[PDB]
Amino acid sequence: VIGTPWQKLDRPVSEEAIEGMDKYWRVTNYMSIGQIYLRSNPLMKEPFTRDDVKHRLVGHWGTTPGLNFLLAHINRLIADHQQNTVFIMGPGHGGPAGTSQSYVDGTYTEYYPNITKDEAGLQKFFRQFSYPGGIPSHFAPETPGSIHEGGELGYALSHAYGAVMNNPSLFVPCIIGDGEAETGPLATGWQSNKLVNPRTDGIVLPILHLNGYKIANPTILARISDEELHDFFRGMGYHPYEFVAGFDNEDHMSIHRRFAELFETIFDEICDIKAAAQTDDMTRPFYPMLIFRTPKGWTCPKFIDGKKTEGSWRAHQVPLASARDTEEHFEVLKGWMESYKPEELFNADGSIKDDVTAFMPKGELRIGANPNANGGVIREDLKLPELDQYEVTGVKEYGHGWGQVEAPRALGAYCRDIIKNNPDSFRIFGPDETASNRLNATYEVTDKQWDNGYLSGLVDEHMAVTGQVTEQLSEHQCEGFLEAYLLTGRHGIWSSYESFVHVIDSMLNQHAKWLEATVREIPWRKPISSVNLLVSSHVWRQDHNGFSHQDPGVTSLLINKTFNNDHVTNIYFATDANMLLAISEKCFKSTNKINAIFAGKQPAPTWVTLDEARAELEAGAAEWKWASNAENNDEVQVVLASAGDVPTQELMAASDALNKMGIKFKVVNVVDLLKLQSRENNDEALTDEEFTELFTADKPVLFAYHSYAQDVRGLIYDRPNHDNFHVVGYKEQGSTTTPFDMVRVNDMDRYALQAAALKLIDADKYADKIDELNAFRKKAFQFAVDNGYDIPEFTDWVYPDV
């Protein structure tokens, strides 16, 4: 247990804590200006001149003094209440407030010992910000206290609410840009309070950083009427509180005492909710939220060159951009930095004075030290059930190609038992598609968590106020809740229709960037559990939905996060349920990855046994020798290779026909796609030797790919024999139609694959046969048009091993 959660003070905030927070706000504003502007002379010691100013002024002042004021007060709250706390910096461009926080709390020098608490360390700390060889301008993963960089805005609320799930002792003050609140993902993030339980989850306090402006415009929420702004928050289930300061001549000590009093009223309401939830965990409370309305750039010069800067969008990035180049801007910078009175905040040796930090929390309650902001320190491996009990044993009993299993059901049973063994640390998220993607075996041991109105057992099923599955129709919510659930040390999986994974392409990009920077250079940030995404209800079988639902291209996005032997991204094609089991175990043991797990939810054959899946998964691609009919590679006339459930079923039927014609081939199944890349691009890929053993040195290779052929063409560009591959993939053809027609129109059906194999072997010899196969594809299409189902010769085919 960290601290003493949800305790009220029952005395006023002390005057010493008020004095300490004003000194914090002054020193963190002074050091944030020093990080943006100074390359030397951090204490302005004689002579202080333009030569001490950076030659490239980069970074963002406007948000920063607001964040520094909130951080003084959240620090005071943590210390006085001993409250386990992680904050979220929505305006992540306020990086200097997050680095200043960790430098004051002492974690900065603990994690970066060269950056010491004295004049030399402070000089290094100022220069390194947003500087070559230095550190980022945002609240990046290399800053203690960060689980959210806030560069791509929108995800502050889903991260906050995912951090509190199953974390009943944790408070998260979530600071949200008022410009960020104009994004789609932030606007739906406020609704998450219908999806957490005040007994079994922790508490988010949204703090809208309503400083009036974004980069070059006012914000929508700051300029609507105050009545509308409070109705809006009350309508989303909050009790809004509003604080306004800095627009008049109120002295800063008075401002701190009024804010401390308000924050204590808010925290007491949060403690009342937490106490009441011990008894009534079914009534959803109106959780507090705070509208914090202060001038953008607060405390900077009111006008610069005749233009209003404090209280304007003009304060967003770098005011005084000529500070190194003109004596006029320099004297303004000098007066601005002097206004914080640093001679009162630092000792002669350059260390921040004890009276500046006496009010701060200590130990693991410090924002920079709390293990929830470095969740791999808390993470334990999952207690996994043995995988063999889930195996589809039909392949062993009856043969390769057996049955009509819906593959994700085996993963549903495996996840049900992972939840039973890990009942508060593994969650499932889905955008109203957990049952549609066939993971509903999980409801045998838990419920979908819904903290909103119930009506009747005739409609509400598998649903309760606490539970380990969460659904909302928003891929941004599912991906963001899971990312923070992992960042805080826990585990989970989500599923999405494949075409709609694209809604969250950019969130995958950012969490991959967070992993890239972590595995490269932040070894104190310990490994977290991977993002596991079941990508299902895929392009080949959108029977009720059609063309808008046909887009497997998240493969191509994921390929753009495969560099530097970081190994943070995996793309897996589950050939059947036993392959899906073997991939899922590997994913659930893995850390520091995004694992995209492709699997079809339609009834489909099972190709391999579980032991076979385990071996083939490790290599990444495998010959299926029981399907190949060639003696050796030299007798091969064509290599039949596939990745994906439906391309594999059509390739296997093509193999059956080609065997019956007397054609010699081998069959290669591909599961771990990036293992096709060269070793020069991927030091864990097949070697050239192993790749040539599979694909041959010089025989044609027909490759039936689940996604866009471009992916495979690009990945194998420097591989031996790559000129001999013919990659057939989805090609933006399809609608609501029958299973055969959907593969027919992308030349992926068994008949077109058999024709393409013959064209690669001898197009002249097999010209008539290729025409007969193309005519059969037309007869089977007319059959579907006339009859309303596919030709039995297509539907009824079973691999002959069965």
Ligand X SMILES: Cc1ncc(C[n+]2csc(CCOP(=O)(O)OP(=O)(O)O)c2C)c(N)n1
| Residue list for the binding site for thiamine diphosphate | 63, 93, 151, 153, 179-180, 211, 296, 316, 500
Q: Is 56 in the site for a copy of itself (CB under 8 A)?
A: yes
- Torsion angle in degrees (nearest 10) through CA of 137, 363, 529, 390: -170
548 or 787: whose CB is closer to Mg ion? Answer: 548
Q: Is 698 in the site for Na ion (CB under 5 A)?
A: no
Q: Is 312 in the site for ligand X (CB under 6 A)?
A: no
Contact residue for a copy of itself among 24, 588, 598, 708 (CB under 8 A): 708
Distance CA 154, CA 507 (A): 10
* Cβ 214 to Mg ion shortest distance, Å: 5
Find which of ligand X, Na ion, a copy of itself, none residue 620 binds, CB within 5 to 8 Å per kind.
none
Q: Is 322 in the site for a copy of itself (CB under 8 A)?
A: no
Helix crossing, 95-105 with 64-81: angle to 10°? 30
* Cβ 169 to a copy of itself shortest distance, Å: 27
Stated as kind and residue range, the H or E segment containing 221 is helix 220-223
Binding part of the chain for ligand X, among 207-215, 378-386, 612-620, 766-774 by CB under 6 A, reads: 207-215
Q: Is 145 in the site for ligand X (CB under 6 A)?
A: no
Of residues 552, 645, 551, the one with CA closest to residue 601: 645
Residue 462 near residue 447, CB atoms below 8 Å: yes
- Tell me the binding residues for Mg(2+): 178, 211, 213
Give the angle subtended at the CA of 138 by the CAs of 478 and 34, to the nearest 5°.
155
Binding part of the chain for a copy of itself, among 21-29, 148-156, 368-376, 657-665 by CB under 8 A, reads: 148-156
Q: Is 518 in the site for Mg ion (CB under 5 A)?
A: no
322 or 506: whose CB is closer to ligand X? Answer: 506
Q: Is 209 in the site for ligand X (CB under 6 A)?
A: yes
Contact residue for ligand X among 73, 76, 93, 666 (CB under 6 A): 93
Q: Is 795 in the site for a copy of itself (CB under 8 A)?
A: no
DSSP code string of 104-167: HHSHHHHH-TTS-SSHHHHHHHHHHBT-TTSB-SS--TTSTT-S---SSTT-HHHHHHHHHTT-
Contact residue for a copy of itself among 387, 463, 619, 791 (CB under 8 A): 463
Contact residue for ligand X among 431, 480, 552, 700 (CB under 6 A): 431
For 157, phi then psi, to 5°, come to -75, -40
Q: Is 737 in the site for a copy of itself (CB under 8 A)?
A: yes
R_g of the chain, CA atoms, integer Å: 30
Q: Is 472 in the site for a copy of itself (CB under 8 A)?
A: yes
Find which of Na ion, ligand X, Mg ion, none residue 538 binds, CB within 5 to 8 Å per kind.
none
C-alpha dist (Å) from residue 422 to 383, 466, 485: 7, 15, 14
Distance CA 632, CA 644 (A): 25
* Cβ 106 to a copy of itself shortest distance, Å: 25
587 or 716: whose CB is closer to Na ion? Answer: 716
Distance CA 174, CA 156 (A): 7
Q: Is 770 in the site for a copy of itself (CB under 8 A)?
A: no
Q: Is 723 in the site for Na ion (CB under 5 A)?
A: yes
Q: Which of residues 505-564 bind a copy of itself (CB under 8 A)?
A: 505-506, 509-510, 513, 516-517, 543-549, 551, 553, 556-557, 559-561, 563-564
Phi-psi label, residue 280: left if phi above 0, alpha if psi -120 to 50, beta otherwise: beta
Find which of a copy of itself, Na ion, ligand X, none residue 346 binds, CB within 5 to 8 Å per kind.
none
Q: Is 138 in the site for a copy of itself (CB under 8 A)?
A: yes
- Residue 573's DSSP bridge partners are 598
Binding part of the chain for ligand X, among 39-47, 173-181, 256-264, 380-388 by CB under 6 A, reads: 173-181
Distance CA 578, CA 559 (A): 25
Which stretches does DSSP call E strand in 648-730?
Answer: 665-670, 701-705, 725-728
Distance CA 645, CA 738 (A): 17
4 or 548: whose CB is closer to ligand X? Answer: 548
3-class SS of residue 3:
strand
Of residues 133, 123, 125, the one with CA closest to residue 101: 125
Q: Which of residues 14-53 bind ligand X (CB under 6 A)?
A: none
Contact residue for ligand X among 142, 178, 471, 576 (CB under 6 A): 178
Residue nearest to Na ion as judged by C-beta position: 723
Q: Is 793 in the site for Na ion (CB under 5 A)?
A: no
Contact residue for a copy of itself among 64, 85, 188, 655 (CB under 8 A): 188
Q: Which of residues 213-272 bind ligand X (CB under 6 A)?
A: 213-215, 219
244 or 445: whose CB is closer to ligand X? Answer: 244
Q: Is 211 in the site for Mg ion (CB under 5 A)?
A: yes
Q: Which of residues 196-255 bind a copy of itself (CB under 8 A)?
A: 213-220, 223-225, 228-237
62 or 368: whose CB is closer to a copy of itself? Answer: 62
# chain residues binding Na ion, by CB under 5 A: 1
430 or 489: whose CB is closer to Mg ion? Answer: 430
Of residues 512, 487, 504, 490, the one with CA closest to residue 431: 504
Q: Is 179 in the site for ligand X (CB under 6 A)?
A: yes
Of residues 119, 88, 117, 118, the one with CA closest to residue 105: 117
Of residues 360, 202, 209, the one with CA closest to residue 270: 202
Residue 159 near residue 148, CB atoms below 8 Å: yes
* Cβ 475 to Mg ion shortest distance, Å: 18
- Show the tokens assigned to 547: 């063309």
* Cβ 474 to ligand X shortest distance, Å: 8
- Show the tokens assigned to 638: 């064509």
- Show the tokens assigned to 711: 């992916």
| Beta-sheet strand order (sheet of 426-430) | 463-464, 448-449, 469-471, 426-430, 491-497, 531-536, 594-598, 569-573
Q: Is 792 in the site for a copy of itself (CB under 8 A)?
A: no
Which residues make Cβ contacts (< 8 Å) with residue 129, sequence separation at least 6? 35, 36, 59, 95, 96, 99, 135, 137
Contact residue for a copy of itself among 28, 35, 41, 137 (CB under 8 A): 137
# chain residues binding ligand X, by CB under 6 A: 27
Residue 314, CB-side half-sphere exposure with 13 Å CA sphere: 16
DSSP code string of 260-313: HHHHHHHHHHHHHHHHHHTT--SSPP-EEEEEEE--TTTTS-SEETTEE-TTSG
Contact residue for Mg ion among 80, 119, 178, 672 (CB under 5 A): 178
* Cβ 715 to Na ion shortest distance, Å: 13
Binding part of the chain for a copy of itself, among 116-124, 447-455, 654-662, 761-769 by CB under 8 A, reads: 447-455
**Tally: H helices and E strands in the chain:** 26, 22
Find which of ligand X, Mg ion, Na ion, none residue 723 binds, CB within 5 to 8 Å per kind.
Na ion
Distance CA 450, CA 291 (A): 27
Distance from the Cα of residue 787 to its chain's centroid: 46
Find which of Mg ion, ligand X, a copy of itself, none residue 62 binds, CB within 5 to 8 Å per kind.
ligand X
Contact residue for ligand X among 63, 529, 555, 569 (CB under 6 A): 63
178 or 650: whose CB is closer to ligand X? Answer: 178
* Cβ 212 to ligand X shortest distance, Å: 8
Q: Is 747 in the site for a copy of itself (CB under 8 A)?
A: no
Distance CA 358, CA 340 (A): 19
Look at strands 307-308 and 303-304 and give their pairing.
antiparallel
The binding site for Mg ion (CB under 5 A) comprises 178-179, 211
Contact residues for ligand X, defined by CB under 6 A:
62-63, 91, 93, 151-154, 177-180, 183, 209, 211, 213-215, 219, 296, 316, 431-432, 473, 497, 500, 503
Residues that bind Na ion (CB under 5 A): 723
